[PDB]
Amino acid sequence: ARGPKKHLKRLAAPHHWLLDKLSGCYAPRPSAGPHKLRESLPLIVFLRNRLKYALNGREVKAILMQRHVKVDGKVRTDTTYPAGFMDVITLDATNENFRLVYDVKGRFAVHRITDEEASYKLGKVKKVQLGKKGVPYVVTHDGRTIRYPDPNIKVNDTVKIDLASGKITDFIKFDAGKLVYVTGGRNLGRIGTIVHKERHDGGFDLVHIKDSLDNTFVTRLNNVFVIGEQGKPYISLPKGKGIKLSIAEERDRRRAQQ
Amino acid sequence: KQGFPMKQGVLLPTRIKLLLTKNVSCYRPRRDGERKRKSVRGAIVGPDLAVLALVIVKKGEQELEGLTDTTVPKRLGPKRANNIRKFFGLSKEDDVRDFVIRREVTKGEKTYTKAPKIQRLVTPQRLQRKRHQRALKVRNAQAQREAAAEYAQLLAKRLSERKAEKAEIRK
Amino acid sequence: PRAPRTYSKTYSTPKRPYESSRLDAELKLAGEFGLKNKKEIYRISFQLSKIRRAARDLLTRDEKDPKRLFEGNALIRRLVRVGVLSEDKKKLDYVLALKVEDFLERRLQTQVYKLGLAKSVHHARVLITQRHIAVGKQIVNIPSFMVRLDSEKHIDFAPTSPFGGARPGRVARRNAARKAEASG
Amino acid sequence: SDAVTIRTRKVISNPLLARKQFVVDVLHPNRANVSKDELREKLAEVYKAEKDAVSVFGFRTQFGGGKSVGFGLVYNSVAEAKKFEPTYRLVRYGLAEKVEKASRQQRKQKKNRDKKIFGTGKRLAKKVARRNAD
RNA sequence: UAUCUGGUUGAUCCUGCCAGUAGUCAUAUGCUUGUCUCAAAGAUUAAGCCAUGCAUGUCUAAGUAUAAGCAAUUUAUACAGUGAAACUGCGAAUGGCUCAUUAAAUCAGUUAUCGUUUAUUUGAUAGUUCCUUUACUACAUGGUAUAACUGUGGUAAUUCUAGA
RNA sequence: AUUCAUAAUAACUUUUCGAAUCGCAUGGCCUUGUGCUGGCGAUGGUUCAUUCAAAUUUCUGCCCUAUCAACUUUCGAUGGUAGGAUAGUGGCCUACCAUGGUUUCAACGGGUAACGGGGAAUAAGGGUUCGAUUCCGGAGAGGGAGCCUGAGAAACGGCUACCA
C-alpha cells in the first residue's frame, strides 16, 4: 500500500507479451494511458521483441527521441507508452504502418497495413452521456471523447475514427449477424458473426458467437468487439482470421508446409 | 557562549527550546513541511553572551575609523525593468535597454561589462505570444458555435424524418 | 528477484536395496554395455516409468478422445524417432511393455560398438569420452546420445581428431620427436 | 588463415537507426579464436562502406571449434555510428578513449561530503582558516 | 510406480507395538572430494544490539545566473556558448528487507460504489471578470521580499546559524 | 432501478478558475508605423471522461482445545431518528429512544514452536505433512502514541514526546 506502485516484476506481466521469465528481474510497466495495464503492447516490448528493430532498452529510447515512432498520428515519445487494440503504430521512416490485432492465440501480432487505410481506427463506444452545457459525447474503448455524435449511436456500438480530427466518419450498430471480434475472455482472438444475446437483467449480459466454420461459443458482452457486417469487414484481419483451429489439426496443417 | 543565537524579542534571558518551522529564523529546514526542536537564547541581554550584534541608527560626532570613514558599494544593480525605472525615476518610457548598470571585468587583456538582463521587459516576442493566445480563444469559440449549429440542424432533420415517418403510419 | 530455475531429478532408487534377483541383473546391464554406475540403469527406468505412466493414462481414456489421440500420436512418434520402438508396434499397447534395455541399446555407447570402429564397448566408452566422435558434423563426448535413426550413418570420427586425419596425434608427435633427435 | 568464409544470416535493414542487423556466421576449419577485430574489415569490403562503420559482438564458439555465431552491425557512415554505438564498444575499436573517473566508491564519498556544505563554501573556507589561526 | 521383512513360544492361530526398508526444494553434522552447467544461503534461537562505509536525487532548445567562474566575441551595449551555487518544479509514499502481530482478522475465489477520493497519462473542455464596472486603469504587461553572493562573528562539537 | 446525466429560477461565497510564463522560426499586408496579422512547440490551468490506483463492501471457505457454556450491553452491545465528522456509506462519534445482537449447525474464551494464498514432499485410489522464503495480497522499521508536507504516509535512510 502507501501509494501507487511504479514497478512491475517479471512473472507478473500479462502472459501475451511473451517476455522470457529469465534475463531480468523486471518487465516494462505500462504508463497510464488510453488502455489498461494488462491489455497493453507497450512500445519497448513491441520495438525490441516483436520487430527486433532495437536490441537494448537504451536504443529503444533513442528511436523515440528522434520522433520516428508515432502512435495514432501523434509522436508519443514514451518508452512504455501503452498501445492497445487497433492502435495504429505508424513509422514515418521505412514507410510501414502496423495495426495492433489479436492473433488466434490471443497474443499481439504484427499486422502491416497500407498507408491508405492506416489513417483510421475503429472504436467500441463504452458510455454515452451528456457533457456540460448539454453537449452529448461518446467514449471509445481507448478513452477518446467525441462531442456531437450521431443520435442513433448507442452503447456497445463501434465507431470509425478519422484519426486526423476528433470527429467520426462511420459507425456500426450492435445487432445480430454483425461481424464481431473477441477482445478478452477464453476465446480471445476470434471473429464470430454474432447470432444472439441474452439480456440477464442485473449484470453480465451474455452473447452467443458462431465461427465461420459453424463453431459456436459464448463470451461475455464486455469481450465482444463488433468490427462490421457479416462478410466484408472494415479492417484487415490478420493471418488465421480468428478460427480457433484445433491442436489436432494444427500439427496436420503445419506438417503440410515444412 | 556556546553559540546559541537569540530569538527576536521573545522572552526569558535564559536558554529555552522551541519547535522551529519555515519562515522562522534560527532554523533552516532540510525537508518540505519539516519542523524541528532547537535550543534558542532569549532576547534580554545578559552577562552570559559572547557576542552582541549592534547597528548604528544615528551617527555621533567622532569618526570611527572602520565604520564611518570607509564605504563599500552595493553588490548588484537592478535587474527588472521597473526596478531600474524607480532607481532613476525619470519616466515610463525611459527605454532602460541602454540604462543597465554594467560591471567591467578584465579576464585578460580583453575587457567586457556584461550588463546582466532585464526581466519583464516588453519584447515583440512577448507581444506575439499574447496575440497567439488571444486569437486562439476566438478561433476555438468560432468552431464551437458552428459545431453545435451543425448538430442542431442534423437533429432537426432527424426529428423531421421521424415526424414524417409516423405521419405515414396510422393511415 | 529473478524467476527461479526449474530443476528435476532423473532417477529413482529401488525400494529393496539388497535383492539378488535384481542385484545381478543390474550388473548384467552394466556388464556388456560399459556403464560405471547403477544410476545409468536407474536413470533409464525413471522415464521408462514416466512413459508407461503416460501410456496407462491414455488407455484409460475413451477411444477417439482427442486428448488420447493427440498425446498418443506424439508419444508413439517420439519414441519411434528415437528408435526404442519398432515401426510395427505403433498401437499404443506395445509401448507399455517395450523393454528395460531397449532404451539403453540406442545410446551412443552401443552405436559406436554396433557400427564397427570400436571392437569392444569398453573401447568405445573411451572413444566417445576422448572426443573422437562426430554424430553429425559436431563433436560429441556424451556416451548417452540416443541416436535418432536419422544419424546412424552419420557417426564418423571428428575431422579435427586423429583416426580421421588432419593431425597425426598428440602422443605420436613427441614419439617421433626422440626419433629425429636420436638419429642426429 | 584458411577458408575464413565469413557469412551473414538473417539480415534485416534497420533504417530507424540507419543500420543493417545480421548474424555473423563464421566457418573457420583448422582455425580458432576468429579475432573479431579482424571481422571488421572482412565485413567492411563486403558492404564496401568502411572499416569504422561496422561493429561485431557475441561470437560464442560452438562445441569443438571450427564454427562461430555472433551478431554484427554495419552503419551507413561513421557519423551515426559514433552517435548510436555504445561508448564501451567504441573504446574497444579505438574510436574513443577511456574517460578518467574515480572509482564508484570515491564518487559516493564526494557527493556525501558536498551535502554537508550549503552554498559555494568559499565563505566557510576563509572562516575556518580565520578560526584555525586563533 | 496397489510388494513388505525380523522380534513374546518347546513348537503355535494373532489388529500388537518395536525394529528394519525407500523418499524429502527437511534441516544439522561427520568423513571424503577430479571436471562442466546450475544454484539456495543469519528463517527457526534473539522483530537481539550495532562501529564504519555506501544504499535518493534530478534539467532540456524551451522557469530564474552580473560566479567579483571558464573560453570564444565580432550573432548582439541588456541577455542569449558552457556553467559551480542557490531559488523554483518534480521525486523521495517506488524499490528493498523481515514475518513480530494477526484465527471471520489477513487471505482466496467472487460481487458493489446509484456509497467515495484519484497526483501522473490520454481525449475533450472557459469570447462573458475594467465592480456606482463614462477616467477607477500599465494592458505594447504591474508590486515585494529573498536565496545564492560580499562583509562582520559565536562556540569543543552537528547537513547549527546571527547581524549588516 | 434513482432525487441520474443535463438544463431552468432565486439568491450565496471570507471568492476558485478563466495564461502579466518560456524556446525556435521568422513569414505576409498596406495609410512603412518598431503598425496590423502570423507557425512549430514547452509549461501551467477549471470541469468531464480515461488510465495508473485507493478506500469501503457481497457470498462461501481456516489449525487445536468444553480441564472454555453461555457471551455482549458499567462508559456502544443490537437497531431507530437527528446531528457532527469523513473523500465518502456506516455507532465512526454525540443526544434521545427501544431492548436488543451471537450461541451445541461449537458462540465466547484459551493455545498456536500461526502472516494468508499461488505452491512443496510423499502418495494405486482416498489421504497425510509442510508452505519464514524468487509471484500476489497484508503488516512492521526498538515498543507505543501523535503529526507536518504532499495526490498519495499515521512514513520512520520525515519530525515530536514517553518508555528501553
Ligand SMILES: [Mg+2]
Ligand atoms: Mg514504466
Ligand SMILES: [Mg+2]
Ligand atoms: Mg496402502
Ligand SMILES: [Mg+2]
Ligand atoms: Mg504365548
Ligand SMILES: [Mg+2]
Ligand atoms: Mg525363541
Ligand SMILES: [Mg+2]
Ligand atoms: Mg488394530
Ligand SMILES: [Mg+2]
Ligand atoms: Mg519406523
Ligand SMILES: [Mg+2]
Ligand atoms: Mg514496499
Ligand SMILES: [Mg+2]
Ligand atoms: Mg514465526
Ligand SMILES: [Mg+2]
Ligand atoms: Mg487533460
Ligand SMILES: [Mg+2]
Ligand atoms: Mg447517520
Ligand SMILES: [Mg+2]
Ligand atoms: Mg443511528
Ligand SMILES: [Mg+2]
Ligand atoms: Mg508468529
Ligand SMILES: [Mg+2]
Ligand atoms: Mg511481499
Ligand SMILES: [Mg+2]
Ligand atoms: Mg507502515
Ligand SMILES: [Mg+2]
Ligand atoms: Mg532490531
Ligand SMILES: [Mg+2]
Ligand atoms: Mg511510524
